[PDB]
Amino acid sequence: NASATPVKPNYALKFTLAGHTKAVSSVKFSPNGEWLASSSADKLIKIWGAYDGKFEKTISGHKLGISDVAWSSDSNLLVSASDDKTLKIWDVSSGKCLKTLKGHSNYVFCCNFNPQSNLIVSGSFDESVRIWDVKTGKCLKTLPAHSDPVSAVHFNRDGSLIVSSSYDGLCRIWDTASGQCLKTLIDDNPPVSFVKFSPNGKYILAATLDNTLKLWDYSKGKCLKTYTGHKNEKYCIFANFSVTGGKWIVSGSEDNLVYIWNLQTKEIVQKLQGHTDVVISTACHPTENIIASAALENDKTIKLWKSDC
């Protein structure tokens, strides 16, 4: 009683990046592919070579831990989101703080530039989404987005839309220009710990704290794919579309592994072993089949992985 008679990636460890003194929170590749930025509970941002993993510099100034970091499209600026209730805009070359973005009334959890990089979007424990002017550092809009902390914020491919997620169990799609809510994605209502648009902007990938990732057609409000087998019941774990080779979904996990799924078949195709604590963050290199992963305080390292597809 059995059946009658696709390629997988082969990610392998290349480098372990040590230096953070507390849990890592977020890793992001620069758009130019040259750098990896890491944020940590240790209040620091570190910059590493994306290709050889070589430590470049520490950027300091936040008064408390950092949950997230994000690059401008020209790779020249970073924004960071901190428990000190601020975001900071950094000149990466000089390491200098250009602007402190003040307005959130509690921890800032998540941040992103728009592709244009004239705006920053932030989400906070204060349950709001804010849109900031990069040039002036002024808050342009406060969206009453959620009824629990905002876990993720992301612009789509042309900057016209924002997606937000919250532990309130909702994903919302916002019109950037007006700040008006275009769509709420909702029955079981598990907390939403992470969301991002697909690179093509047609789909959103949402992580829920029932050990599940789902690919939504948000226009149709229909779930097209489900990815599971990993552990996620507590943390905001960054997930990704890997598009440089085979079409994969990449995520961290509370079982200390990096999970890679076939986007179409939803099968687990790789589990990357090596981290010694929760893998809180994954990132995919913009041009090469390279993954960065980072872990919580029993580990505190970033790992770089390479695949042939």
Q: CB of 249: closest distance to ligand YJR in angstroms? A: 9
Closest CA to 111 of 18, 201, 45: 45
Give yes or no for a contact between 259 and 267, defined as CB atoms under 8 angstroms apart: no
- How many residues lie near ligand YJR (CB under 6 A)? 10
Residue 60 CA, chain-centre distance (Å), reads 21
Burial-class residue 265 by CB neighbours within 10 Å (0-12, 13-18, 19+): exposed
If phi over 0 gives left and psi between -120 and 50 gives alpha, with beta otherwise, what is residue 33? left
For residue 198, state whether it binds ligand YJR (rule: CB under 6 A): yes
Q: Rule CB under 6 A: say whether 247 interacts with ligand YJR.
A: yes
200 lies in the site for ligand YJR, by CB under 6 A: yes
Q: Are 232 and 246 in contact (CB under 8 A)?
A: no
For ligand YJR, which is the closer residue by CB, 82 or 282?
282
We find the least distance from the C-beta atom of residue 81 to ligand YJR, in angstroms, to be 25
222 near ligand YJR, judged by CB under 6 A: no
Q: Which of 35, 125, 241, 305 binds ligand YJR (CB under 6 A)?
A: 241
Report the candidate in 244, 236, 228 with the shortest Cα–Cα distance to residue 291. 244
How many other C-beta atoms can be found within 10 angstroms of the C-beta atom of residue 291? Answer: 27
Binds ligand YJR by CB under 6 A, chosen from 18, 223, 224, 309: 224
Of 7, 10, 91, 199, the residue at the interface with ligand YJR (CB under 6 A) is 199
Site for ligand YJR in 250-269 (CB under 6 A): 263
3-state secondary structure of 141: strand
Question: CA nearest 56: which of 64, 44, 65, 48?
Answer: 48
Q: Which is nearer to ligand YJR, 233 or 267 (CB)?
A: 267
Residue 140: CB minimum distance to ligand YJR, A: 25
Least distance CB 205 / ligand YJR (angstroms): 7
Interaction of residue 232 with ligand YJR, rule CB under 6 A: no
The binding site for ligand YJR (CB under 6 A) comprises 157, 198-200, 203, 224, 241, 243, 247, 263
